[PDB]
Amino acid sequence: VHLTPEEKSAVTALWGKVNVDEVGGEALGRLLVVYPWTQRFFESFGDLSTPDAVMGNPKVKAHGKKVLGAFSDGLAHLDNLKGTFATLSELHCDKLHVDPENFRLLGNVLVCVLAHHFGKEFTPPVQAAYQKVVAGVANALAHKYH
């Protein structure tokens, strides 16, 4: 997924300042809360009954790190998302059976969380960079569905 020099630099500069343990958990938190049907996949995480139950559920915060960590390999290999996420595309489709539509949703919630933490720093151009990265990860995880 094709980014300008200024964009690739912009993204990584903002990512470097990101709390990898905190942000992943707020993203998955906010997915499980705003798009309630997503709880189907994570019924094994115990109590997802309230916004607070969900945000303060250790299994969520935990899973958040795996997801956010996986976006980091994504940022490490933007010229090779299709490959970086391959075994993991297999996993989400072949064993979990996640509708790829939800990848786009998580990604967009991730964008809402970055804008929430980075305030005025999450400029329209910075968003447009991150929107390309997040659609890229979504595409890669969707590849081994067809």
Partner 1 sequence: LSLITKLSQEDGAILFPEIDRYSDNKQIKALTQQITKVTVNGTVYKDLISDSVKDTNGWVSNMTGLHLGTKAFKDGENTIVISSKGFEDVTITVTKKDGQIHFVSAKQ
Partner 2 sequence: VLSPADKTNVKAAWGKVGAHAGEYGAEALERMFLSFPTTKTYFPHFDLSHGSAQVKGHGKKVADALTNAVAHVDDMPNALSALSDLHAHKLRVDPVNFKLLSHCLLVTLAAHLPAEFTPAVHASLDKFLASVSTVLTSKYR
- Using the rule CB under 6 A, is 130 a contact of ligand HEM? no
CA distance 9 to 82: 21
Q: For residues 93-112, which are near partner 1 according to CB under 8 A? A: 95-96
Task: Rule CB under 8 A: choose which of 53, 62, 75, 135 binds partner 1.
Answer: 62
Select from partner 2, ligand HEM, a second copy, none the partner in contact with residue 28, using the beta carbon and a kind-dependent cut-off of 5 to 8 Å. Answer: none
Q: Quick one: 80 or 106, whose CB is closer to partner 2?
A: 106
92 among annotated binding-site residues: yes
* HSE-CB of 47 using CA atoms within 13 angstroms: 8
Q: Considering the complex, what minimum distance in angstroms separates the CB of residue 98 from a second copy?
A: 17
DSSP for residue 40: G
Is residue 61 within 8 Å of residue 25, measured between CB atoms?
A: yes
Q: How many CB atoms lie within 10 A of CB 146?
A: 5
Of 111, 105, 104, 109, nearest in space to 129 by CA: 111
Is residue 140 within 8 Å of residue 89, measured between CB atoms?
A: yes
Q: Considering the complex, what minimum distance in angstroms separates the CB of residue 91 from partner 2?
A: 14
Q: Considering the complex, what minimum distance in angstroms separates the CB of residue 22 from a second copy?
A: 30
Residues that bind a second copy (CB under 8 A): 1-2, 132, 135-136, 139, 146
CA distance 82 to 106: 18
Residues in the site for partner 1, rule: CB under 8 A? 44, 62, 65-66, 69, 87-88, 91, 95-96
Q: Which residues are annotated as a binding site?
A: 1-2, 63, 82, 92, 143
